[PDB]
Amino acid sequence: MNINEILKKLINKSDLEINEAEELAKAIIRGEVPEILVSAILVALRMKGESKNEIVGFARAMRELAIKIDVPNAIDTAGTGGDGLGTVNVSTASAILLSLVNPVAKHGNRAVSGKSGSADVLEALGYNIIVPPERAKELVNKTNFVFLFAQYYHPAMKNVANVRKTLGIRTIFNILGPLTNPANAKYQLMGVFSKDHLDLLSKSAYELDFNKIILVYGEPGIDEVSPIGNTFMKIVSKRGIEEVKLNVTDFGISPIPIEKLIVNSAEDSAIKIVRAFLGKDEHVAEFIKINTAVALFALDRVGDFREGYEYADHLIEKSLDKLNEIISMNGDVTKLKTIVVKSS
Amino acid sequence: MNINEILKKLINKSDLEINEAEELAKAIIRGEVPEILVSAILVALRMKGESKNEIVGFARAMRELAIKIDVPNAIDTAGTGGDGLGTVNVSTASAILLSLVNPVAKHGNRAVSGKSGSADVLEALGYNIIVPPERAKELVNKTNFVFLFAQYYHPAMKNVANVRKTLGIRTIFNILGPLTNPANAKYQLMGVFSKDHLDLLSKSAYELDFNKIILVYGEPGIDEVSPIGNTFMKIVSKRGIEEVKLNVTDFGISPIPIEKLIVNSAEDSAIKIVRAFLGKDEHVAEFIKINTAVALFALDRVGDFREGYEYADHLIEKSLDKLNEIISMNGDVTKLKTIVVKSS
Ligand SMILES: O=P(O)(O)OC[C@H]1O[C@H](OP(=O)(O)OP(=O)(O)O)[C@H](O)[C@@H]1O
Ligand SMILES: O=P(O)(O)OC[C@H]1O[C@H](OP(=O)(O)OP(=O)(O)O)[C@H](O)[C@@H]1O
Ligand SMILES: [Mg+2]
Ligand SMILES: [Mg+2]
Ligand SMILES: [Mg+2]
Ligand SMILES: [Mg+2]
DSSP states (O other): OOHHHHHHHHHTTOOOOHHHHHHHHHHHHHTOSOHHHHHHHHHHHHHHOOOHHHHHHHHHHHHHHSOOOOOTTOEEOOOOOOOOSOBOOHHHHHHHHHTTTSOEEEEEOOOSSTTOOHHHHHHHHTBOOOOOHHHHHHHHHHTSEEEEEHHHHOGGGGGGHHHHHHHOSOOGGGSOGGGOOTTOOSEEEEEOSSHHHHHHHHHHHTTSOOSEEEEEEETTTBSSSOSSSEEEEEEEETTEEEEEEEEGGGGTOOOOOGGGGBOSSHHHHHHHHHHHHTTSOHHHHHHHHHHHHHHHHHTTOSSSHHHHHHHHHHHHHHHHHHHHHHHHHSBOHHHHHHHHHTTO | OOHHHHHHHHHTTOOOOHHHHHHHHHHHHTTOSOHHHHHHHHHHHHHHOOOHHHHHHHHHHHHHHSOOOOOTTOEEOOBOOOOSSOBOOHHHHHHHHHTTTSOEEEEEOOOSSSSOOHHHHHHHHTBOOOOOHHHHHHHHHHHSEEEEEHHHHOGGGGGTHHHHHHHTSOOTHHHHGGGOOTTOOSEEEEEOSSHHHHHHHHHHHHTSOOSEEEEEEETTTBSSSOSSSEEEEEEEESSOEEEEEEEGGGGTOOOOOGGGTBOSSHHHHHHHHHHHHTTOOHHHHHHHHHHHHHHHHHHTSOSSTTHHHHHHHHHHHHHHHHHHHHHHHSBOHHHHHHHHHHHO
């Protein structure tokens, strides 16, 4: 693996082979490549426009270097993020409903834009987001749910922290985290932030070896099933990549005004979700349920999205309690009660 | 003027304003921009493809911080380099013949591609490549020739050496060289390795305040007058940029074997050259004459491309003697003669 040959190759706008990319990624994440060259590379890759092999290459590298646990049968609902509209922490909430009928390995980080980060609500809720791997497995067995805090499950990325911060621009590492679930979940719902990444990441995904992963991009430009209108999807499986366009009305609901689904703090997000669980905020609930319906489909638990939406209705009614047993086994329920009160 | 804004601008592939480039180049050459961003900026600037205005901005920044000497009437023959052929140092040689008729302020550096660096030959021929401004003035009056070592007349450029070396790829700075003659020569024959850069550089030079500078691209893929076929050149002055296409034959000569114009070290170049001066290397000598010919057309001491080849035919006969006096005034004549002995 010659750093120079690689760089010159990217500069000429030639895509790498999966293996070149993986060795390249491996060197960078290991800390064996001078910052000047990591910067050059990340910048070259972006201006060339990353290709499938490249994504595949880097993903495989990151999985390899990441702290792992084995729960392939699990499902994750992490999205790439980056839309920055501060919407409520949907997929996290949605991860609570899923754990009721299937092991859930929720991968995520704290907020980058705003403060509605997956790891932040869980914290605001009473959950102890920093879980050691040996414990992580125990929890998923006892409660069917664990949150895998990325910073900690991908310690190696520390060797790229300075370049990324100094560069202060989006790079290939901004859309890779969801393809790197630390527990190797084979089923997942991952939202991307642009129609273009929907095409690239689904093609990449097709080779990262999932049983079923559903990539989505919903209007007005968030990485979720769209709560106001259309949702562009890609259902990936050993069979291929299926294209599917969906409107929020297909779930049998009227479009939800998005201002209703936007938060301004972690606690505010937590309250939105509990109130949703408690039936005191139909809007957030419909948002949590349209996302869960797509996840449920990924698991092959329903025949269509409507069935998925109705089924999700039965899950949300048991989620508050579910949330309580999960947080009791790994956190502080008094914080959950406080949040509950704060929403009654 | 913010670096992060410049970076976003380039990542977006938008060309900079001359003023912007100049301030950007200033900070970089002044060593006040973090190596990480300098790497990114240089890479993006290359992938986007540099613009006439960016070239002009950097050139002006560099010129401003360079150390200078007064000799505008002088002529130079430095080329962009980087054609990857390892050919023999023709313009350094072509400069020797020129000092026979016009003061020569030759700008150059050590090789990045082989050893065939114009500065390396001289070192090998016995010349003392580091010439202080005061001494340089003296040498040009007496011998009518002087070498301006880029690494000495551009002391600030050392603030970009680590990034450039670490990168190990060509950037904007690898084409700015000949446009920043320390003696501010108003005349010269600028060689370029690609027809594309031939256009960019010609248009840029037009605004760089020259009396007459001829840019040339050699058919085989060399940045000199072609020894095997066509030569594309632009005659830029204050009145415009003329288009001109040549063939080795228009010099009344025949195609020359590039196989014999190739060198594999500083000394082989120093030998091919002296060998041609001794009239013992028909081919090397022909390659020199044709370039010299164009450079004479530039000084307007010949109004015909074949008349210049004829005039060059004279000059080479007195060449060795000139080289001899040049070396004994600023250097070690010993070396030179051992080379003569090795050229027989
Ligand atoms: O900024 P957003 O509109 O939220 O988009 C980013 C992602 O976050 C949402 O879930 P959650 O809040 O749990 O975040 P995560 O997917 O990043 O963990 C949702 O599932 C998106 O995929
Ligand atoms: O790689 P090359 O085929 O040599 O082309 C690069 C330049 O070098 C040649 O002269 P010289 O060898 O003296 O180098 P210089 O122009 O860098 O001084 C010639 O003037 C070219 O313009
Ligand atoms: Mg999400
Ligand atoms: Mg989201
Ligand atoms: Mg040259
Ligand atoms: Mg050359």
